[PDB]
DNA sequence: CTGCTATAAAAGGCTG
DNA sequence: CAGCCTTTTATAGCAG
């Protein structure tokens, strides 16, 4: 196509392998907050990379924000070691990606009313719900939100070619709709 | 503007 | 038991 999605957001789980009181890491961890009554988790935040961490008591974290694996191991790793410098016995096991997010711009308007007639096996498009046409690809399996823009969001990946196989199948269809 | 509408994914405690 | 809740991010509609 010419075009490459550019990742927005990639969500990474890591275990620290040991319980954690957070209470005490709110306490001591700066920009960290712990509110068990309207989450389970401790809220950690670093500016670089800029993300968001959710640490649980049993030693597992979520990592989210981030715009590239890297950079989500990397952000993963600093959370790890402030968790570690407060005294708990931190490891870094089976870090994963879970999720990534990719966005890009076709250029040209799409007639989502004739892709969803054509592509009804896939598609979900009500747009006095929701503007976007939500189309579920199965090979890859990933999830697009096109727009009449011309704007595409692709979610649901472990590995970036998966965005970009998703993105280069739906290319072909798009040209087929431009409005 | 805010907070909804929809998407994926994980963590784990909570309600139904 | 299932499903909600929170967190993130592109996208773009809506009522207040």
Same mark, same amino acid.
């Given at each position: 196509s010419g075009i490459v999605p550019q990742l927005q957001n990639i969500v990474s789980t890591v275990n620290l392998g040991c319980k954690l009181?957070?209470?005490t890491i709110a306490l001591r961890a700066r920009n960290a907050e712990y509110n068990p009554k309207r989450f389970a +988790?401790?809220?950690?935040?670093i500016r670089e990379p800029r993300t968001t961490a959710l640490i649980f008591s049993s030693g597992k974290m979520v990592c989210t924000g981030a715009k590239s694996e890297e950079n989500s191991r990397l952000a993963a790793r600093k959370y790890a070691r402030v968790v570690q410098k407060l005294g708990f016995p931190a490891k870094f096991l089976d870090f994963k990606i879970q999720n990534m997010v990719g966005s890009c711009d076709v250029k040209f308007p799409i007639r989502l009313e004739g892709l969803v007639l054509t592509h009804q096996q896939f598609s979900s498009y009500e747009p006095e719900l929701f503007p976007g046409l939500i189309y579920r690809m199965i090979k890859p399996?990933?999830?697009?939100?096109?727009?009449?823009?011309?704007?595409?969001?692709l979610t649901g990946a472990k590995?970036? +070619?998966e965005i970009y196989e998703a993105f280069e199948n739906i290319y072909p269809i798009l040209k087929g709709f431009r409005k």
């Open positions: 009181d957070l209470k +988790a401790v809220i950690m935040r399996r990933i999830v697009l939100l096109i727009f009449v823009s011309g704007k595409v969001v590995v970036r +070619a």
